[PDB]
């Protein structure tokens, strides 16, 4: 039977291998949604050639690129099989991955997809918080889309632009951290210090208001209610990227501060990316991790397992589409209301595209 | 019979008249868990001094003091009344107030409560959300008192330190947002946005790692969910002093770009304190009102009630104290971890003190 509702999976992406770190770069620096630069269009290659080198060694030090593709196509597949189970009314339904920065992107996706001819479109995101910079971008991608090619939509679209407290990721967030927790000492099982690190943002964009604080705030308590609180935490975000102010605490700098004031055992959870991404100082340098375990005696720093290929991760995303169909809602009422200080005119736009759909 | 358990009540307090401003200040700026300051015992004063004025204006505005004496005793006189019924075996319980910054002062409370021969003692915070910059500091003048007079206590002591998501606090918040709701003209009572505002804090201590923005997002995503996210919402931080960098958006600035952007009805709620405090510039400032109203058409701004006397509030403390003396729990699995970059050394004597109390 021919494709009849599609879920667009939106996330960044990430270079496959290290040969394409320089386009992921140069489509990320170039992006408007995400940052804000003068004489963009000129400053944003310059950006990503210079700093492609360094990228690609971080990439190389996880295995020389990034596995997302290879995850989100096998959540999609498991994804699709259960939807079909669960929505006969709706089915056949086709998962399309639209990534941002890197093939297949976001228009390549919507292109086919109009093109399968199909009656229904979703546009899932994939980050489960959101930020403007992140799910927002993805988001405009799609208005711009249309705008850009002068076109009307041939589908019916609507969004799942958030799911921050969904039972069953929160469920999959407690699994892996009680599955890491086993591989430290019993006798120090108790003492683990349980460290939520999700990327950081600019504090600019925090105080503009940023909806991604307070919805990874939000994550956090529901794991550690589902946990029962067995072990003391501390929400940090990784940042180190550039001079100007950024969230913190620093990842970095509290796992240094944690085991100078007698924390010797550290359990580092991804709780804002779903895929193995680039990690912490103390993980990678060994330089640094000898002067830490020198001077503080650092014990066990470990990390808890992306969600990868959990099936129950896949049934988390089914769940979710399953919901959001039949609550016929076309987004989340808080893609409703934009930043307070808002200063990107296509995000209103973007709220209409959506809010404004048929049916 | 003679009381047997007695509930310390600890919160910063307020100056009940103008005339209490200037020692409340004092106090304030004295307090070395709150901030450090050089040359603090003569700096405090000079400051206190000179702010004196300002902020007895400020008390004026919304009344002429702070009400939370009376508050904070009807509260303790109702979660009695309910303790005495709930758990006849730690009966009678009698409830202290302790405050910060102004009599009865937490020092003078426990002196009391020493005095009539207590046989269990509870620090109870009445702020839901943990910062070391309140709790902390009231927990951290409990060991400091035994301290300084150089005597172990004669009670046995232990803390409910934290409930930012205790299901009844959520309920009376649920319950006052929509009573304020119904306050708004019925063909906007969609359209009106839910400005959560909490007690912005320095960030130098959010990125100490302080725990209080994330529980208080945690407080906001419970209440949004049992309000079955009716209406858009933001967190938004108020009050910041001084010219340093502190946790934004800024309430001030958010409800004057929210109204730039076409939102002309918006819903205040005190999130983070349970009694009436002082306002924010737009509520209390005629010329900025008049401005805002003129260039944008602010047509509704109004705020949620304080907690106050509800008396579903003082079933809420009475089910948190009943819950902590059923679990026998010294104090929160959070207490238990410092903040990362913690350079106040009394605060791990504090936790000490707690976590090793007989029982
Ligand atoms: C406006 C805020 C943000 C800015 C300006 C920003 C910027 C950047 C930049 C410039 C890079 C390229 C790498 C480099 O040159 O070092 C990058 C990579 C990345 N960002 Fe962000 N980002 C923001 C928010 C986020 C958020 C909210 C998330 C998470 C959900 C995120 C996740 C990532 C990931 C996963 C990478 C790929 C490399 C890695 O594994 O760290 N970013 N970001
Ligand atoms: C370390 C962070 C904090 C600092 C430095 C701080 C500082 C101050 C200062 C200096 C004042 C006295 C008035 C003035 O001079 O303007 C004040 C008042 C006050 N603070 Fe804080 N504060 C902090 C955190 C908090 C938090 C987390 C809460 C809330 C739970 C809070 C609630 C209040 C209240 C209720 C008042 C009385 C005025 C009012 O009603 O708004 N403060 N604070
Ligand atoms: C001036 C501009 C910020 C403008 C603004 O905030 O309104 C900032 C943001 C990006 C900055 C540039 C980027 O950081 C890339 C380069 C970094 C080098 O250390 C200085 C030159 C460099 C080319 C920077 C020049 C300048 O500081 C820039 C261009
Ligand atoms: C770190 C990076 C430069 C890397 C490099 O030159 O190798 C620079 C260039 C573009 C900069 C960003 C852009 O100037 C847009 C934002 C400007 C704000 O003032 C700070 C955050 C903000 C998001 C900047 C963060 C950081 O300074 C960036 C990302
Ligand atoms: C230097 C110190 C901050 C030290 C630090 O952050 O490590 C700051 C914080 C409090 C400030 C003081 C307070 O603001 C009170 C006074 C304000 C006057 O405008 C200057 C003198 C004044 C006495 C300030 C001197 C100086 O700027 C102080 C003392
Ligand atoms: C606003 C007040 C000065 C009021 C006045 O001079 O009239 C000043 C004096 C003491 C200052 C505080 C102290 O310097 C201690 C902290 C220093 C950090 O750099 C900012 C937060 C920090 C908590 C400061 C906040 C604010 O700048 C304070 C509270
Ligand atoms: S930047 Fe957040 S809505 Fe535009
Ligand atoms: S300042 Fe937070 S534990 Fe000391």
Redesign the interface.
């Known amino acids: 039977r021919k494709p009849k509702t599609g879920i667009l999976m939106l996330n960044m992406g990430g270079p496959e291998t290290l040969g394409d770190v320089h386009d992921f770069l140069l489509r990320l620096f170039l992006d408007r949604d995400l940052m804000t630069l003068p004489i963009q269009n000129k400053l944003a290659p310059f950006i990503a050639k210079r700093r492609t080198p360094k990228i690609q060694e971080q990439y190389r030090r996880i295995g020389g690129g990034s596995p997302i593709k290879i995850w989100t196509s096998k959540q999609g597949e498991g994804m699709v099989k259960l939807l079909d189970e669960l929505s006969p009314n709706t089915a056949p339904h086709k998962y399309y991955i639209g990534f941002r920065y890197v093939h297949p992107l976001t228009e390549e996706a919507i292109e086919e997809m109009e093109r399968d001819g199909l009656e229904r479109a979703i546009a899932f995101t994939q980050y489960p918080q959101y930020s403007c910079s992140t799910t927002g971008s993805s988001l405009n991608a799609i208005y711009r889309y249309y705008n850009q090619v002068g076109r009307k939509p041939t589908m019916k679209w609507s969004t799942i632009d958030r799911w921050?407290?969904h039972h069953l990721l929160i469920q999959c967030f407690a699994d892996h951290i009680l599955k890491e927790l086993d591989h430290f000492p019993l006798e120090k099982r108790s003492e683990v210090?349980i460290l939520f690190s999700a990327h950081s943002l600019p504090?600019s964009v925090?105080?503009?208001?940023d909806?991604y604080?307070?919805?990874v705030?939000?994550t956090?308590?529901k794991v550690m209610?589902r946990l029962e609180?067995?072990?003391?935490?501390?929400?940090?975000w990784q940042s180190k990227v550039g001079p100007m102010?950024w969230?913190?605490?620093?990842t970095d700098?509290?796992?240094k501060?944690?085991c100078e004031?007698g924390?010797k055992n550290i359990l580092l959870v991804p709780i804002a990316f779903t895929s193995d991404h680039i990690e912490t100082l103390y993980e990678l340098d060994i330089e640094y991790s000898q002067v830490l375990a020198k001077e503080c005696g650092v014990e066990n720093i470990r990390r808890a397992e992306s969600l990868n290929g959990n099936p129950l991760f896949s049934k988390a995303l089914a769940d979710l589409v399953h919901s959001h169909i039949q609550s016929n809602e076309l987004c989340?009422?808080?893609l409703?209301?934009?930043?307070?200080?808002?200063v990107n005119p296509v995000c209103?736009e973007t709220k209409s595209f959506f809010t404004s759909q048929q049916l």
Do not use: D, F, H, W
């Not at 609180?229 to 940090?236: A, D, E, K, S, T």
């Not at 969230?247 to 620093?250: E, K, R």
């Open positions: 921050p407290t210090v504090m925090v105080n503009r208001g909806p604080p307070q919805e705030s939000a956090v308590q209610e609180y067995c072990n003391p935490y501390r929400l940090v102010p969230l913190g605490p620093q700098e509290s796992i501060g944690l004031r924390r989340s009422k808080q409703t209301l934009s930043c307070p200080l808002c209103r």
